[model samples]
Target: GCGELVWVGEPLTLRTAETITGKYGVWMRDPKPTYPYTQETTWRIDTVGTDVRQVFEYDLISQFMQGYPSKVHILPRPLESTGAVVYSGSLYFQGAESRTVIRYELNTETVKAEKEIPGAGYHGQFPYSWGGYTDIDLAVDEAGLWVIYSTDEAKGAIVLSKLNPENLELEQTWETNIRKQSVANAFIICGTLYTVSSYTSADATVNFAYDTGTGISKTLTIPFKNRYKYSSMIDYNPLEKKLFAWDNLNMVTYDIKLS
Candidate 1:
């Protein structure tokens, strides 16, 4: 059932229908008989049970207008477990282009203090562009929080840093001269941390693995085709002891059998 009207200077009323059976009717007309000014009204109802109630509304403009600095964009990355905490990296515009990594404790519902990763400096082009420290991958273990990322200075060489999540202190820093860049993500399985290595050539590799017990990293060749140029959101299932990676769209699995 529907109702429509056009109001001019004169008042006019239309009959309303109590119920609509099978077919519906529609009427359209101009409001002002003069020519310039015109008004139209429309009302309709459907019996197909397609009515929907308003759930919730989010105002992103209001959030930005409120001077809410330090907005973090957390990507949907795979985690070790459902109860595991997820941390996100943010660019501090207020500060001197300082890239800060914020850790959020999901289980505790608290943000575990902001940590300013070492090697933060002026990037290129703009003063706010802090060079180094990008494409960060995080892994948590009994030892501490491990961060693997690539730096612009080292020519896309992958670097490793272990930090104390409690105090946001840098425990160790390791850098490799190898020109491996675009590390999308990493994960830990059975105390072993694995990071994806994106190459410039036609091949992509998952080259590094950190042993939490011995504090050592060993390289491994990925047993897959190099069709996709990049991979991210890597995760490991502890129960199956297998490594899983999402190459943007497709899911890839690797058997990680630790003897």
Candidate 2:
């Protein structure tokens, strides 16, 4: 039951975070939820320092914007960039400046697992055009878990891989023609990978899509907006059918239409 993206709605502005570090960060809900931490729960990370370890949890969207976190967890290790994702009770993120991804269990405050992405670029060797040590981006969509990164073998082109959720092992990978540094941000939806044209433009387009199902890449011109003028992270939440984004100081969402 896969469909092509047909429409992208305007940015729905959420409140700006209280901290200046929130100017560039990631905030999202787990698309595939677990009990206790349901879809209404939101997680925020302000990636502003060398030792960033705080994971803020809010009971609801209202509580998040109001700076009222129900609880905050301190990560055992620092995270890199704004590419981390939450899935099935674990926070998956890149180990600071490395290609290694760590899965930290929320309930136990323990590191469940860690795995390195072989030969992948990290610490700015290959990042999205805007660059924040964003060499490894973990994403989740309708199909399953995925990771986006570039390898020396790919020569900076985007390499997409489906990952085994439990072990962080590569299930399959596809090498796309698009250069990793050319796009502002990217996300997966219905098994298709889409890229945004510009991060700082008021009006941008979801200009390209690479479908894993077809092993084909296509040009697109679906209108996308960067309301805050600096979009660092974009990820699709399948359950909500929306894009969770971190734009400058704002954490927002965009509705989408599929055909």
Candidate 3:
């Protein structure tokens, strides 16, 4: 969209800007530092309502860092309906060379019920020439938190499933196909999962969508570049029905019409 400023927060400086993840009336910030990414310091901020007049509430700088190989995420439900119960799915090192989609229940504060998805080299890895990074994208919907792993890495076979809303465990799942877009930035519109392209060219803009409900696919492209050079994170607001992007320094909004 052309863009408009709705809410602005108090100014403070961190090592680097963190990506903001939002759900319901609450929003959680991603953990990424300025230059050096800190382990223990990997934390996020939670805020209720878009009250620019209020300050953000800081919780523990715990271990739940959100990224993807994995989401652009798998969103966590707030404690109420989709509270902070997160069934985190990603390449977790089971051993020195072991990589698995570690699934656990993060109840806002700590990790519990640690388990692993039943797969072998069969799963995602910890950045060691393990073919390529996992084609896993995580997110949550009205159904619950879910993981969409491109079961067929190269393209297609993207599976969607529900992670237990309470215990944060994997549940029934479904599979779809082909690559319309990269996981650079993913947002759900209706029941279709839409993603944008990486800024690999100055004259290219690509978008892909796969409807989990209908299994239909669509792709759209623009012959120009977005004004924002690079974006690290993007999110959708069901209430506002608009998409948001963090263009490194500035936060921008776009109309729901990506097609």
Candidate 4:
């Protein structure tokens, strides 16, 4: 059987199935913008035989006058086959910009939602300023607490915080860097944090690795070579001990080991 529901004032197409390779999936359509602007919608697909299901939809809105382009953006797929903890934010423009983080647990087949991180509010000075997006990078330690790297472009700086999923409290704030900008995503391994520099020049896009234990930062240049553009969405697999970099259709994996 098939059914449809409207969320966020937009209609979403959904399907239900029995005895399928995957439990569910979804197909979503782009909503027409109020103005002559472009908009994009993303759909999650999981199917079994003739039954297809749509799970969730992510919408991207862009203002042409402000140089924003509407495009559907897919969540990043983990580099290693091992499971990963993924997080994304729902952005809304209201009296003050508000954001909430959504979490997915692949292995457990669970999805969790957390209240918006504290301190992110709208700015009146820039009326066009919209809510910030949440970028989540994960690192699990032997102690069971996960180190979370998150960034909000409007708020400024990248943040290192500890998240106790059990309690859902941002227990502590570890570090901050002024230079960090819209760090779309990041990865951590063996106490080292790696992020793609938002500022890129004609020659190269900078990638950085910071050692939490040693308190040292190392910057490396990713040569664009004119042919290749830039890359982001870096993910680290603790099980495989590798780093994955992606830019649209191209994907690269690096064997990363820290001494």
TM-score list, all predictions: 0.44, 0.96, 0.48, 0.46
Q: By the lDDT metric, which is better: model 1 or model 4?
A: 1
User: Model 1 — TM-score against the truth?
Assistant: 0.44
Residues 1-259, candidate 3, lDDT per residue (tens digit)? Answer: 2221222222222222343433211233322112222222222222222221111322333223223111112223211111121122221112112222333222232234343443312323211111223334345443435544443343344455565544436676665554423345454555566555654522224356676666677776533343445444344544344444434344345544433
Q: lDDT per residue, candidate 2, 69-180, as tens digits?
A: 8999999898899988998888999999788999898878889889999889999988988788888899998888899999999989999999888889999999999999
What is candidate 4's lDDT per residue for 30-142, written digit by digit as tens? 22222222234323233223322223333442221123223333333212111123222221111112333334332243444344555532222111111122233344432
- lDDT, model 2: 0.87
Off by over 4 Å in 3: 1-108, 118-134, 152-156, 180-183, 198-206, 221-228, 249-259
Show model 4 residue runs off by greater than 4 Å: 1-98, 105-113, 120-155, 182-185, 198-207, 214-232
* Residue 151 C-alpha lDDT in model 3: 39
Tens digit of lDDT per residue, candidate 1, span 1-259?
Answer: 1111111111111222234320121111111111221222211111111221111111232332233313232322211111112222211111123345554332233455566656532222111011122244455443435665555665556556776666567787766554334343455555555555544422445566665557667767653333343333344434333443433233344554343
Off by over 4 Å in 1: 1-98, 120-134, 150-156, 180-195, 198-204, 208-219, 225-230, 236-240, 249-254
Write down the TM-score for model 4. 0.46
The best-first sequence of candidates by TM-score reads 2, 3, 4, 1
Give candidate 2 regions above 4 Å deviation. none
Best by TM-score: 2
* lDDT (0 to 1) per candidate: 0.37, 0.87, 0.36, 0.35
Model 3, global lDDT: 0.36
